[PDB]
């Protein structure tokens, strides 16, 4: 199947790697029982103005995000750096819930990289924002027949806000070059303006309640987690593991790495997590990949035999996988270490060939001086390759050998001179017609 052919010539072929498979799955989340207070965020009698937007900290609780659909009749989340359906599988150091009221045509401004009056003077999201924006129409609560003027936004400001910066100042704004002296004049405006939310307004002019959930998915200790039961901690076995949402497969062993208290994960050169602090016991654990290695198949031609020998490359014969059952080791075929002869080479463990003390010319190279051949009952044998026969030269101070005859030899040397000249119609190959 690797060669995509039904016939194989004599040789050695690199097939897929073997891999020890995880025996179980481990989940390790912090011991937290309190439920996060999302009810009082989405069920407030009145929301703040966007210029004076409220920020609430969520910590040390269990966050089930599927209950947010019950507190408010919004149609969907709008999340960044995360999907709404994966929130329950994750852990965060903190959560912040920002809540305010804007009008419908400004909701597009609650997003990273936006400009406009709201995004520049009232509420600004960072370009690297990770979190979710939940907005829903609130015409039935924030509108009045005479108009609702309790909700305000900043219209004038000397400079744009930084991300997550709040400005509740009410100093008179100077649009011209004359001083204002704390008085609204001609180019001196009061910086705040009120929405006039009326029930008769069109959709884009209607009030919308917005909740912004911001969190951190970077490696750090976590106190907000989704609904997820923890299993026990299994060491010295190949397992699937989940530490605070960080998933992977490998063997967990006790670590002597000295994490600082703010460190939950350790990363290697390839930015892969190779160390983790257990969220419950607070112990440091090393992560190592389970077990793997290259497999080569040594065959004479299928015209000769269907017998093969297998080389486990760069591997102790004792670490050759012996995992029982087909779900603990890929590939699922098995070659018995006792059934077929086992030989240790510096290139790895060779199974299926008998090593012999004779030395022959190399037929199928295995590596590190070992070659294999199909010889006599015919079977695959392994041997140390022969460099040739020894010849002691009868040298002395006064001895010479002089030929008395000669042989006229005619030998052949083959040299490539040219290769096939090819032409490609780029458009035909790529685009057809």
């Amino acid at each position, epitope marked *: 199947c690797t060669l995509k052919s039904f016939t194989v010539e004599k040789g050695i072929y690199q097939t897929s790697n073997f891999r020890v498979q995880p025996t179980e799955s481990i989940v390790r989340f912090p011991n937290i029982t309190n439920l996060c207070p999302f009810d009082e965020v989405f069920n407030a009698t009145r929301f703040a103005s966007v210029y004076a937007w409220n920020r609430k900290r969520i910590s040390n609780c269990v966050a089930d995000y599927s209950v947010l659909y019950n507190f408010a009749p919004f149609f969907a989340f709008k999340c960044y750096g995360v999907s709404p359906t994966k929130l329950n599988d994750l852990c965060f150091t903190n959560v912040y819930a920002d809540s305010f009221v804007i009008r419908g045509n400004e909701v597009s401004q609650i997003a990273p990289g936006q400009t406009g009056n709201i995004a520049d003077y009232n509420y600004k999201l960072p370009d690297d924002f990770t979190g979710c924006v939940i907005a829903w129409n609130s015409n039935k609560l924030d509108s009045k027949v005479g108009g609702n003027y309790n909700y305000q936004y900043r219209l004038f400001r000397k400079s744009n806000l930084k991300p997550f910066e709040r400005d509740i100042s009410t100093e008179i704004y100077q649009a011209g070059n004359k001083p204002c002296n704390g008085v609204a004049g001609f180019n001196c405006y009061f910086p705040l303006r009120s929405y006039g939310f009326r029930p008769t307004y069109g959709v884009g002019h209607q009030p919308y309640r917005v909740v912004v959930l911001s969190f951190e998915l970077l490696h750090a200790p976590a106190t907000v987690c989704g609904p997820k039961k923890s299993t*026990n*901690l299994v*060491k010295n076995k190949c397992v699937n593991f989940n530490f605070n949402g960080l998933t992977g497969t490998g063997v967990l*062993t*006790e*670590s*002597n790495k*000295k994490f600082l*208290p703010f460190q939950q994960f350790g990363r290697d050169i390839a930015d892969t997590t190779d160390a983790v602090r*257990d969220p419950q*016991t*607070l*112990e*440091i654990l090393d992560i190592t990949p389970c077990s793997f290695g290259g497999v080569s198949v040594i065959t004479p031609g299928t015209n000769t035999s269907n017998q093969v020998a297998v080389l486990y490359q760069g591997v102790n014969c004792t670490e050759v996988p012996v995992a029982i059952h087909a779900d603990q080791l890929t590939p699922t075929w098995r070659v018995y270490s006792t059934g077929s002869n086992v030989f240790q080479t510096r290139a790895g463990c060779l199974i299926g060939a008998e090593y012999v003390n004779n030395s022959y010319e190399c037929d199928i190279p295995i590596g590190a001086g070992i070659c294999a051949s199909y010889q006599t009952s015919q079977s695959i044998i392994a041997y140390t390759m022969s460099l040739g026969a020894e010849n002691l030269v009868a040298y002395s101070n006064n001895s010479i050998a002089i030929p008395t005859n000669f042989t006229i030899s005619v030998t052949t040397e083959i040299l490539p001179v040219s290769m096939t000249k090819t032409s490609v119609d780029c458009t035909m190959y790529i685009c057809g017609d």
Partner: antibody
Framework: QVQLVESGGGLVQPGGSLRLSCTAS????????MSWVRQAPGKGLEWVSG????????YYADSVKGRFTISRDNSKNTLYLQMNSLRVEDTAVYYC??????????????WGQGTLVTVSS | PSALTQPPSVSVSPGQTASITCSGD??????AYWYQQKPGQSPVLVIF???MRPSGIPERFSASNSGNTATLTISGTQSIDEADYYC?????????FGGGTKLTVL
């Protein structure tokens, strides 16, 4: 409420033998590594031996090596310290302490009351 | 490491600051653990992993481990804090303790 109760301590003649037993309650016994630590009257604390969570790996101090043997029964939630060839220096109050690991990142979070092994003639 | 050197005794008046030290070869490269043992009582852990305290240990307790020494500082030493404090570390799956220090409260 985690509770470690010790038993099996008494007077022995030198060269005799004992078996200490430590029983844990109100805790997952298999999830903890266990250890024996002794304190002679007036002297300091000395780690005697410790056993892994499953009991597959065992560790002993040099002054106690070969002589003592530590085992555990996860079904009974009990830790055993088989004591033999007890020399005079072995007189101390013996504690059993639970810890999650022995790689360096875990403390002895729970200690027992302590059992006395006095050896003399 | 292998020998955690510790002063015999530290004498402190109520409300003063006690500073019990633990010395060992490059002790700053390992985690440090402090236990408080009272007369006729079992040991009680008060510091784990250098500077962390178990739940229920009074906030007055503090510790550090830099260089080749680890120190335990009970600020505002009260009469209750009179006890025998110990210092512990791990080495090759073996626990190593310090000699011990009695905090004599005046």
């Amino acid at each position: 409420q985690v509770q470690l109760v010790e038993s099996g301590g008494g007077l022995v003649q030198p060269g005799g033998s004992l078996r200490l037993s430590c029983t844990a309650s109100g805790v997952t016994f298999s999830s903890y590594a266990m250890s024996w630590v002794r304190q002679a009257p007036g002297k300091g604390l000395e780690w005697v031996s410790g056993i892994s969570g499953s009991g597959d790996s065992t560790y002993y101090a040099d002054s106690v090596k070969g002589r003592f043997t530590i085992s555990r029964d996860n079904s009974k939630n009990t830790l055993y310290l088989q004591m033999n060839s007890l020399r005079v220096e072995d007189t101390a109050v013996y504690y059993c302490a639970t810890h999650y690991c022995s790689g360096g990142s875990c403390p002895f979070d729970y200690w027992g009351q302590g059992t006395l092994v006095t050896v003399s003639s | 490491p292998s020998a955690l050197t510790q002063p015999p005794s530290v004498s402190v008046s109520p409300g003063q600051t006690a500073s019990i030290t633990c010395s060992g070869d490059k002790l700053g490269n390992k985690y440090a653990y402090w236990y408080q043992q009272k007369p006729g009582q079992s040991p009680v852990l008060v510091i784990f992993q250098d500077t962390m305290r178990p739940s229920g240990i009074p906030e007055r307790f503090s510790a550090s481990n830099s260089g080749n020494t680890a120190t335990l500082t009970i600020s505002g030493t009260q009469s209750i804090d009179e006890a025998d404090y110990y210092c512990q570390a791990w080495d090759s799956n073996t626990a190593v303790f310090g000699g011990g220090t009695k905090l004599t409260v005046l």
